[PDB]
C-alpha cells in the first residue's frame, strides 16, 4: 500500500530446481516429502521438406511468391 510493489507471504515462491532426468526428478520429489505433479516431455516431430516439394508440377504445394 505504501509504494505499489508486489509483496507475498510465500517463502517457497521463487524456487526452481533444474534436474536432468525424470526418474531422479520423481525420486527426489518422493524423497523430500512434498506431493508432486508430472507433466510429460513433447518432442518436435520430424518432418519431410524440400525446395523441390515447394516447386512441384501438378501438386498444389506451390509457394507462388518467392
Amino acid at each position: 500500500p505504501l509504494m505499489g510493489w508486489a509483496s507475498t507471504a510465500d517463502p517457497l515462491s521463487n524456487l526452481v530446481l533444474t534436474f536432468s532426468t525424470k526418474e531422479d526428478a520423481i525420486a527426489f520429489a518422493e524423497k523430500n516429502g512434498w506431493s508432486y505433479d508430472v507433466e510429460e516431455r513433447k518432442v518436435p516431430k520430424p518432418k519431410s521438406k524440400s525446395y523441390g516439394a515447394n516447386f512441384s508440377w501438378n501438386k498444389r504445394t506451390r509457394v507462388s511468391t518467392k
Binding site: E39, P44, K47, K49, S50, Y51, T65, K66
Partner: protein
C-alpha cells in the same frame, strides 16, 4: 534401406532419405544459426546464416535445401564456417538501427543472441544505414519496418497458412520494402500469430507495445479457453 550415413563432425549417424542437413544436426543435438528457416513453413534459402562447410568442397553450402547424399562428413565448427558466419553477421548489422532500448524484443531478439554467440565484435561500415518508411498494417499489430531484415518469413506464412496474400516484396537492391503497397489492413484470423513469426522486433503487439520486457516476467503453464481446441 531408408538410411544414409553422415559423419556429423566425424560422428556417424543414420538419416532418413530426402531430409536435409539441419534436421540431421537437430537429430545429433547440434543447432545451426538460422533466420529464414522455420519448422512450420516452406524452405526458402534466403538467410545465408545457416552455412556449413562440407569437406572436398570449394564453396560452402546452405544447410536448409541441400539433400543428404550418401556418406557425408559435415564440419559444423570448421574454420571458414566460423569465418562465413562472422561475415554474414557483419553484413546483417549494417542496415539495422540502434533501437535495442526502445525495441520490443530485448531479451527475445534473435539478432542479439546470434550476434553474441556467432558474430564479430568490432564493426565497420562508417557511413550509410538506409531508413525505411513504416506502414500501418492494422490497429492490432504495431509495425516499424526499419527493423525488418527482409528475412521473408511472414510472406510464406501468409501465402501458405493464411492464404491471404497481402504482404509482398517491393523493390530491389537495398530498397526492398516488405509490406502491402495499397495501405490495406492485413486483417484475418491467425493474424496474431505473425508477431511471433517475426524473428526481430519489426511486427509486434499493439496493446503490449511498451508495457514490459521479457526478462522480468515469469512464464506459467496454462490451457486455452473460449475454444473447443485448447
Amino acid at each position: 534401406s531408408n538410411l544414409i550415413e553422415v559423419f556429423v563432425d566425424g560422428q556417424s549417424v543414420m538419416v532418413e532419405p530426402g531430409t536435409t542437413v539441419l534436421q540431421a544436426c537437430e537429430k545429433v543435438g547440434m543447432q545451426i544459426p538460422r533466420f529464414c528457416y522455420h519448422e512450420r513453413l516452406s524452405v526458402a534459402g534466403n538467410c545465408r546464416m545457416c552455412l556449413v562447410e562440407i569437406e572436398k568442397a570449394p564453396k560452402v553450402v546452405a544447410a536448409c535445401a541441400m539433400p543428404v547424399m550418401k556418406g557425408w562428413n559435415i564440419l559444423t565448427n570448421s574454420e571458414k564456417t566460423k569465418k562465413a558466419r562472422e561475415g554474414v553477421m557483419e553484413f546483417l548489422l549494417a542496415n539495422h538501427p540502434l533501437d535495442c532500448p526502445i525495441c520490443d524484443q530485448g531479451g527475445e531478439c534473435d539478432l542479439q543472441d546470434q550476434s553474441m554467440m556467432f558474430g564479430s565484435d568490432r564493426s565497420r561500415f562508417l557511413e550509410g544505414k538506409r531508413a525505411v518508411e513504416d506502414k500501418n498494417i492494422g490497429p492490432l499489430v504495431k509495425t516499424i519496418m526499419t527493423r525488418c531484415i527482409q528475412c521473408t518469413r511472414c510472406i510464406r506464412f501468409a501465402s501458405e497458412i493464411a492464404g491471404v496474400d497481402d504482404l509482398g516484396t517491393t523493390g530491389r537492391g537495398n530498397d526492398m520494402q516488405v509490406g502491402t503497397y495499397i495501405e490495406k489492413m492485413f486483417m484475418s484470423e491467425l493474424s496474431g500469430n505473425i508477431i511471433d513469426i517475426c524473428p526481430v522486433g519489426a511486427l509486434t503487439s499493439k496493446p503490449y507495445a511498451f508495457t514490459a520486457r521479457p526478462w522480468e516476467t515469469r512464464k506459467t503453464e496454462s490451457i486455452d479457453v473460449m475454444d473447443a481446441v485448447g
